[PDB]
Paper text:
Nonstructural protein 1 (Nsp1) of SARS-CoV-2 is a multifunctional protein with an essential role in viral replication. Nsp1 is a 180-residue protein which consists of two domains: an ordered N-terminal domain (NTD) spanning residues 1–128 and a C-terminal domain (CTD) that comprises residues 149–180 and which is unstructured in solution.
Initial attempts to generate a crystal system suitable for CFS using an Nsp1NTD expression construct consisting of amino acids 13–127 produced crystals that diffracted to lower than 2.5 Å resolution (data not shown), making them unsuitable for a large screening campaign.
Numbering used by the authors: 11 to 76, 79 to 125
Write the structure that this text describes.
């Protein structure tokens, strides 16, 4: 399918144990997509002070359309040194590996895969 319905665990930034997906834009997009498929991907909501506590390159989920069955349609965009790879809408959060942290909420998304 071109899209897949997922419910992402929302994590507090200070709880996150693995603070990024890798060391290049291509690698983080690849690993984010794999973790999304495997159910091992968390979401951190972006506020002041959040991104400096995580590791670049960042992977964002951004809104791609203006929400079937409550799932916001999203796509992935990476960022490294102020340059973004991908073009999309508002940021819903930054993705990180999930390795068992306890979430504060869930964000329902329809991921363009």
């Amino acid at each position: 399918k071109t899209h897949v319905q997922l419910s992402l665990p929302v994590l507090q930034v200070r709880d996150v144990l693995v603070r990024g997906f890798g060391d290049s834009v291509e690698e983080v997009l690849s690993e984010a997509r794999q973790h999304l498929k495997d159910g091992t991907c968390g979401l951190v909501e972006v506020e002041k002070g959040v991104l400096p506590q995580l590791e670049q390159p960042y992977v964002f989920i951004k809104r791609s359309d203006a929400a079937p069955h409550g799932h916001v349609m999203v796509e992935l965009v990476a960022e490294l040194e102020g340059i973004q790879y991908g073009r999309s809408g508002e940021t819903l959060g930054v993705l990180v590996p999930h390795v068992g942290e306890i979430p504060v909420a869930y964000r329902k998304v329809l991921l363009r895969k």
